[PDB]
Each structure stands twice: as C-alpha cells, then as structure tokens.
Amino acid sequence: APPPVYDTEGHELSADGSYYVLPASPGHGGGLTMAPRVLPCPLLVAQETDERRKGFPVRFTPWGGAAAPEDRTIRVSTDVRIRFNAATICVQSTEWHVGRRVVTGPLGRENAFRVEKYGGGYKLVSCRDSCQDLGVSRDGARAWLGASQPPHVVVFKKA
C-alpha cells in the first residue's frame, strides 16, 4: 500500500483521530475552519488568517465508509472523505465536497479527496474527476480553500 500519512508527532493518521490542519511553516496563516460566505448556510472551508488560530480539527474516513477494509490507517494518494469534527450552526453535514471552493452540507465523487506528500508536509487534493490541488485565496475578510495554485502545504496536529 502507499505510505501512511503522519501527524506532527510522527504517528500514522487514523480514521479514529481528529487533526488540526495547520501550515507546514510559520508565516502562512492559521488552521482550517468553517465559515459562511454570504448566505449563513452552507458553511465553506476557510483558512484562519490569524496564525495563532488552529481552527477546527478534521476527521478522515477511508473511501467506502464502514465497507472500506478494516485497516483504517489514512494513506497518501488514496480516496478519503474529510469532515470537521465539530458541532455546526447550520445543522448540516460537516463533510467537505467540491461542486472552485470547498463547501460543507448537502450535495459522483464530489466528496472525494486525497492527501499527497508535498514540500515540507502534505497537500490536500480534490479528486472528483482528475486530482486538483487545493490552495487558499484571500477574498476580502476571508481566505477560502479551493482548487487553485499554489497548493496550501499543511501538517496534521492530533487534537
């Protein structure tokens, strides 16, 4: 199998754990959060502009869910679903999907992502059809995660 994804303490990522998604280096902003874009729902995936803010941790789920193989180690280059492990003001799914921007809430493969080793950490990729790197775009007061260059390089700090 492809290698496991590792957290900032060097342990393999697990489908059981929750992980803050932080930049791999200082001076690149804070962690990922969910925030409304003009409408209060659905929430979209934003990056905190403030470096001190870790945002909300995420949970990874191997593609297939309960029907995926029993080895639920999270690995690179492998379809996974991603959600925020957090209560939401929208009473909707916190699972990520792409239709540009990464959105949560109700909707093939719109919710398929992968993690790839990249630079000093990992990049996240949307793989609805072909794999597209996810990057951050400042948009007024907010910075949004979407399909864009350059990729946003991240590490996973276990909560």
Side-chain angles (χ1 to χ4, degrees), residues 2-3 16 19 25 32 36 64 69 78 94 96-97 99 101 105 132 144 150:
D16 288 338
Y19 299 88
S25 297
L32 296 185
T78 295
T94 63
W96 292 14
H97 72 265
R101 293 178 210 100
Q132 301 194 288
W144 300 107

Side-chain angles (χ1 to χ4, degrees), residues 71-83:
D71 179 17
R72 307 288 169 84
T73 294
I74 306 303
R75 296 182 179 276
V76 307
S77 329
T78 295
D79 293 333
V80 293
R81 287 190 270 111
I82 300 167
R83 71 170 169 96

Side-chain angles (χ1 to χ4, degrees), residues 98-100 113-114 123-135 146-149 151:
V98 178
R100 208 137 208 76
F113 296 89
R114 293 179 186 179
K123 63 177 174 183
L124 299 177
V125 316
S126 169
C127 297
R128 189 194 36 251
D129 185 358
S130 75
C131 291
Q132 301 194 288
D133 295 341
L134 305 178
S148 74
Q149 321 295 314

Side-chain angles (χ1 to χ4, degrees), residues 41-99:
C41 295
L43 303 181
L44 286 68
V45 176
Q47 183 194 3
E48 301 278 10
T49 52
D50 183 341
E51 186 169 342
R52 303 191 191 282
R53 292 162 85 30
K54 294 191 299 269
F56 286 114
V58 303
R59 297 276 298 281
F60 293 91
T61 298
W63 195 252
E70 291 192 67
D71 179 17
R72 307 288 169 84
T73 294
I74 306 303
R75 296 182 179 276
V76 307
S77 329
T78 295
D79 293 333
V80 293
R81 287 190 270 111
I82 300 167
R83 71 170 169 96
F84 281 118
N85 200 50
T88 172
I89 290 154
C90 277
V91 181
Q92 286 175 339
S93 182
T94 63
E95 193 173 79
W96 292 14
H97 72 265
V98 178

